[PDB]
């Protein structure tokens, strides 16, 4: 059939409708740090005809604590969004965490997001449904693609149908991740022919680490993000930074802010002749 289509303003994600870029950076650091990162993506998108959704997050919770650089806090967090917002009037995105705060957040951001870790949490499916915004079910590393029609189900069941599926890779043996390009469709088909997207930072993150032959970073984001794009994704998802990120030069991987442009020119041209490619199939 044709692919379902959750519509974001002039942008429309869909599996035969170009890789929309849910670009961005990680932890919402400086109301103005953003800007280097916010503004810089925006230019390029346009130069290439890539649509753009800026990604930013208002919190921490995952890893180190007792405050340890926990991020902006909904209150002060949500302001910074509202700035770069009209500054260059663009589509943003944010992951809630614990129900309540699932509405305020859902006013500055265009595409809310549910953390891989709480996917099977119900009360947030529920508490993101008694909303009606664009949801981005971030896929858990321990869920076979084929269970995603079970995060989607209850979403619609919660009133909310506007869903998106972001794949990040599954774990491979202790501390490692992988991505099977064959998981995409599988997710595509259980998810009412819904839109499927590749998150390469949080993915490649551990994929590069297979210590012995690792024990110390190294990146190939475009080399792995080409694989996804070369199969047929609704979109791509990446985070950037000049000096890899205070939040990405320690946690996951990270895209070199100024290295962005030609990466996309790869992703645009590669993708290019795929959404083109007239539907083929080899089950006969």
Curated annotation (Swiss-Prot):
Pathway: Carbohydrate biosynthesis; 3-deoxy-D-manno-octulosonate biosynthesis; 3-deoxy-D-manno-octulosonate from D-ribulose 5-phosphate: step 2/3; Bacterial outer membrane biogenesis; lipopolysaccharide biosynthesis. Disulfide bonds: none annotated. Its main location: cytoplasm. GO terms for cellular component: cytosol; protein-containing complex. It catalyses: D-arabinose 5-phosphate + phosphoenolpyruvate + H2O = 3-deoxy-alpha-D-manno-2-octulosonate-8-phosphate + phosphate. Its EC number is 2.5.1.55. GO terms for biological process: keto-3-deoxy-D-manno-octulosonic acid biosynthetic process. GO terms for molecular function: 3-deoxy-8-phosphooctulonate synthase activity; identical protein binding. Keywords: Cytoplasm, Lipopolysaccharide biosynthesis, Transferase. The keyword Cytoplasm applies. The keyword Lipid biosynthesis does not apply. It is an enzyme of class 2 (transferase). It is found in: Cytoplasm. PANTHER family: PHOSPHO-2-DEHYDRO-3-DEOXYHEPTONATE ALDOLASE (PTHR21057). Synthesis of KDO 8-P which is required for lipid A maturation and cellular growth. Homotrimer. Belongs to the KdsA family. This is 2-dehydro-3-deoxyphosphooctonate aldolase. The gene is kdsA.
């Amino acid at each position: 059939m044709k692919q379902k289509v959750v519509s974001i303003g002039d942008i429309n994600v869909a599996n035969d409708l170009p890789f929309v870029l849910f670009g961005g950076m990680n932890v919402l650091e400086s109301r103005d740090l953003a800007m280097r990162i916010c503004e810089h993506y925006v230019t390029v998108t346009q130069k290439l005809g890539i649509p753009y959704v800026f990604k930013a997050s208002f919190d921490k919770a995952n890893r180190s604590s007792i405050h340890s650089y926990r991020g902006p806090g909904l209150e002060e967090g949500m302001k910074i969004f509202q700035e770069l917002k009209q500054t260059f009037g663009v589509k943003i995105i944010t992951d809630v965490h614990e129900p309540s705060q699932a509405q305020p957040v859902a006013d500055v951001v265009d595409v809310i997001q549910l953390p891989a870790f709480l996917a099977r949490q119900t009360d947030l499916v529920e508490a993101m449904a008694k909303t009606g915004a664009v949801i981005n079910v971030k896929k858990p590393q321990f869920v076979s693609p084929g269970q995603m029609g079970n995060i989607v189900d209850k979403f619609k069941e919660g009133g909310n149908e506007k869903v998106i599926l972001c794949d990040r890779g599954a774990n491979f043996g202790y501390d490692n991740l992988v991505v099977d390009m064959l998981g995409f469709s599988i997710m595509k088909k259980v998810s009412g022919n819904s839109p499927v997207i590749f998150d390469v930072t949080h993915a490649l993150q551990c994929r590069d680490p297979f210590v012995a032959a690792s024990g110390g970073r190294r990146a190939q984001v475009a080399e792995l993000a080409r694989a996804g794009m070369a199969v047929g994704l609704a979109g791509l998802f990446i985070e950037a930074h000049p000096d890899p990120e205070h939040a990405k030069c320690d946690g996951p991987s990270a895209l070199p802010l100024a290295k962005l442009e030609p990466f996309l020119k790869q992703m645009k041209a590669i993708d290019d002749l795929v959404k083109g490619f007239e539907e083929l199939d080899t089950s006969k």
